Design a protein around this ligand. Structure first.
Ligand SMILES: *[C@@H]1O[C@H](CO[C@H]2O[C@@H](C)[C@@H](O)[C@@H](O)[C@@H]2O)[C@@H](O[C@@H]2O[C@H](CO)[C@@H](O)[C@H](O)[C@H]2NC(C)=O)[C@H](O)[C@H]1NC(C)=O
Ligand SMILES: *[C@@H]1O[C@H](CO)[C@@H](O)[C@H](O)[C@H]1NC(C)=O
Lengths: 99, 274, 8
């Protein structure tokens, strides 16, 4: 089955510049399982991102969380880039701190 | 209340690129606690929750051996299904399995289950009776026939009533400070303009555990479930969860809409507004 | 602890 991934980017706590937090990129509802997920800080890949909470729903689509610790600043921007067979090209979803 | 022990298993072939990737991920309720990934540098069962530090080295060695055996068996299954479905050896295919047991607050078995899927589609599943299997297609019927002659249901049922329930009880006991806790949701409402003198009101619920929660929007005391928009509850990277639900309302009348949050950690439900 | 899965 070919199901396009839903990509959600969010912080653990409402962002406050200068305070430790956690950034999350939850990639869901996809199939097949092969997938590439990168978290980016100012356009550059973040190293040592932790992958967790892998699972599947009743319809068998996959769910997985990428996360990393981070301290937001006023200027730094973050995003999550995903490559999956259901998409001709990589999809990038930016963190919207005002959502 | 009730608790669960679940194992999510995945085997994925990759012709021309070596052996299938095999993965096992275990959860107690909504908390990930163990994992096995055949693609790791030195594949081993690993703890994913802090309280699993309470198991001795024998636990890890035995689970790692079981996983490596499961890995080989699934490698064979992938090839077997190619035959059942008459498919080529050049394409990637997926086997998925969810197995687990649930106990009541008294620790007695409530239910057990095991379901398989091939390439994202139902393959075979254990019936609630824990005695028979239901096959989704003719390929799975071949498996059902093999399992009936081998007594597979009886073996799985013994695992459920024995190993599954007993270790679930042990995990709840050892990780009690984590698994039996209740983290109260903290809520906020955000506001965003839209074209046409309309506003998007978004209700957030953060830092809660367990994952079950209910967020609704009200007007005139009636739930606007119909026109509500939201995301599935999701993990926030530290063992807690978050969720949001929004509604589009007429500018200048935001004050008549209220968000309601119900959770185990809220003795009295939360009521907020812009 | 997990189950020892049976062949398909
Ligand atoms: C979680 O349970 C412990 C008791 O259980 C401890 O001993 C074994 C059962 C083992 O699984 C081990 O991992 C676990 O920590 C509670 O602590 C005990 O609390 C009682 C009072 O309720 C005290 O009299 C005991 O001295 C104390 N034991 C220890 C070693 O501290 C603990 O309170 C509980 N955690 C929470 C927050 O509910
Ligand atoms: C099996 O699949 C092949 C394609 O690999 C096809 O040519 C053949 O007709 C099929 N035979 C059966 C048993 O259906």
């Amino acid at each position: 089955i070919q199901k396009t991934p839903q990509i959600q980017v969010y912080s653990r706590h409402p962002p406050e510049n200068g305070k430790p937090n956690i950034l999350n990129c939850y990639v869901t509802q996809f199939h097949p399982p092969h997938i590439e997920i990168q978290m980016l800080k100012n356009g550059k890949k973040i190293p040592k991102v932790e992958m967790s909470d892998m699972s599947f729903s009743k319809d068998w689509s996959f769910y997985i969380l990428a996360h990393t610790e981070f301290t937001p600043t006023e200027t730094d921007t973050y995003a999550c880039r995903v490559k999956h067979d259901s998409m001709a090209e990589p999809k990038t979803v930016y963190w919207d701190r005002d959502m | 209340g009730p608790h669960s022990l679940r194992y999510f298993v995945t085997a994925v072939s990759r012709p021309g690129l070596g052996e299938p990737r095999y993965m096992e991920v275990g959860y107690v309720d909504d908390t990930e606690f163990v994992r096995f990934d055949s693609d790791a540098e030195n594949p081993r069962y690993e703890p994913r929750a802090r309280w699993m530090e309470q198991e001795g080295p024998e636990y890890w060695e035995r689970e790692t051996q079981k996983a490596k055996g499961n890995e080989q068996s699934f490698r064979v299954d992938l090839r077997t299904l190619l035959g059942y479905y008459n498919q080529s050896k050049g394409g990637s295919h997926t086997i998925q399995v969810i197995s687990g047991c649930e106990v009541g607050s008294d620790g007695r078995l409530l239910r057990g289950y095991q379901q398989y899927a091939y390439d994202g589609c139902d393959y075979i599943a254990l019936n609630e009776d824990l005695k028979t299997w239901t096959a989704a297609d003719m390929a799975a019927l071949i498996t059902k026939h093999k399992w009936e002659q081998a007594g597979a249901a009886e073996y799985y049922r013994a695992y459920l009533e024995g190993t599954c329930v007993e270790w679930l009880r042990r995990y709840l006991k050892n990780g009690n400070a984590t698994l039996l806790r209740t983290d109260s949701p903290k809520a906020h409402v955000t506001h965003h303009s839209r074209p046409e003198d309309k506003v998007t009101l978004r209700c957030w619920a953060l830092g809660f555990y367990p994952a079950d929660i209910t967020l609704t929007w009200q007007l005139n005391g009636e739930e606007l479930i119909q026109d509500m928009e939201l995301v599935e509850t999701r993990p926030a990277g530290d063992g807690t969860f978050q969720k949001w639900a929004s509604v589009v309302v007429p500018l200048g009348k935001e004050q008549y809409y209220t968000c309601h949050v119900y959770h185990q950690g809220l003795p009295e439900p939360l009521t907020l507004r812009w | 602890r997990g189950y020892v899965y049976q062949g398909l």
